[PDB]
Amino acid sequence: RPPLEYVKGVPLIKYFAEALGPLQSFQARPDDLLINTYPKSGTTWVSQILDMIYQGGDLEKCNRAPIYVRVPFLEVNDPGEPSGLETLKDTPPPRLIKSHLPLALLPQTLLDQKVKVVYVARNPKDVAVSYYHFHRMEKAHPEPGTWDSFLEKFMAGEVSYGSWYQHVQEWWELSRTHPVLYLFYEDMKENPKREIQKILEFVGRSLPEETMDFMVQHTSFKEMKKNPMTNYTTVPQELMDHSISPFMRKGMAGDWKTTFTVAQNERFDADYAEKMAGCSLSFRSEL
Numbered sequence: 001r002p003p004l005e006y007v008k009g010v011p012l013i014k015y016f017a018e019a020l021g022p023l024q025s026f027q028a029r030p031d032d033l034l035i036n037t038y039p040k041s042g043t044t045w046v047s048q049i050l051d052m053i054y055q056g057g058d059l060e061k062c063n064r065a066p067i068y069v070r071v072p073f074l075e076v077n078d079p080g081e082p083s084g085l086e087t088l089k090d091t092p093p094p095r096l097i098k099s100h101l102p103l104a105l106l107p108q109t110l111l112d113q114k115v116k117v118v119y120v121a122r123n124p125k126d127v128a129v130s131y132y133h134f135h136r137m138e139k140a141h142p143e144p145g146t147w148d149s150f151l152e153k154f155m156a157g158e159v160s161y162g163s164w165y166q167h168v169q170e171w172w173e174l175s176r177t178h179p180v181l182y183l184f185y186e187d188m189k190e191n192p193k194r195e196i197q198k199i200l201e202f203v204g205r206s207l208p209e210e211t212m213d214f215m216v217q218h219t220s221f222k223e224m225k226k227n228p229m230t231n232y233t234t235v236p237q238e239l240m241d242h243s244i245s246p247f248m249r250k251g252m253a254g255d256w257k258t259t260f261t262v263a264q265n266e267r268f269d270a271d272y273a274e275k276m277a278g279c280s281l282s283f284r285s286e287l
């Protein structure tokens with residue numbers, strides 16, 4: 001469990017920090033589609049929906065390989081696996097790219113080329129809980145310690161990829177001057193079909209009503225949990241140890257209520273009120 005490295009004010013996992021070198025040579029294509037999110041906000045879920053739309057709704061094509069192979073993770077630079085930049089050299093256009101990078105660290109080529117971006121945000125409480133367990137099972141992140149300890153660091157933005165408040169705000173802001181579909185995890189939970197339809201419209205594609213419903217079922221938590229091509233059980237137990245905490249934990253909005261103590265919840269609400277003061281952004285802590 002290596003410590004974080006700071007780059008341009010952003011805490012990152014050593015392997016990611018390093019990948020930033022080669023990334024300066026990455027060339028974006030006009031027809032690329034970027035999927036950006038703060039960690040644990042629904043990356044894998046929207047990646048599956050998008051790969052299905054691109055594969056015309058064919059499940060056997062989506063089965064072609066694990067999601068992290070179909071949707072390369074830009075910064076990924078894990079031990080004993082192809083770098084993200086590498087995997088992208090051989091990915092057939094149009095490409096689907098995954099990333100958690102803040103605007104400060106995102107390769108300029110993506111902005112210059114006006115690449116469309118699908119962004120997904122989730123209420124901070126659930127993100128914090130989900131991120132704590134992820135720290136437990138993902139052997140690449142530093143020691144999370146106790147939940148109380150973690151939560152403190154989460155509020156200070158002292159975790160991989162940095163501040164969640166700043167991440168969601170910047171992207172929300174950028175969606176004025178750049179083509180950005182800004183989605184909400186909770187909305188996706190509430191009415192899948194309604195959201196996938198916004199996506200289809202965004203990428204400018206269309207599908208038969210019946211194919212649509214089909215995706216809805218195969219992008220369900222239940223389904224994605226059994227599917228080994230999307231539940232991350234195909235990576236070594238030295239990268240991810242699912243016995244500690246499954247990658248697909250609960251898939252619920254509102255589950256934070258069973259982890260936050262009343263004291264923690266009070267401390268967090270006050271803090272959040274200060275940080276989100278002048279922002280038009282609005283999150284639903286439950287359904």
Ligand SMILES: Nc1ncnc2c1ncn2[C@@H]1O[C@H](COP(=O)(O)O)[C@@H](OP(=O)(O)O)[C@H]1O
Binds near residue numbers: 042
């Ligand atoms: N089809 C789906 N429906 C709902 N939640 C899903 C999902 N697929 C994955 N998730 C949830 O999305 C989170 C991980 O997101 P990311 O891919 O950005 O890391 C996890 O949250 P929880 O651990 O709270 O359940 C995971 O269980």
Ligand SMILES: NCCc1ccc(O)c(O)c1
Binds near residue numbers: 039040138140
């Ligand atoms: N280091 C293992 C790969 C990894 C690390 C952090 C993340 O947030 C993610 O989605 C994937």
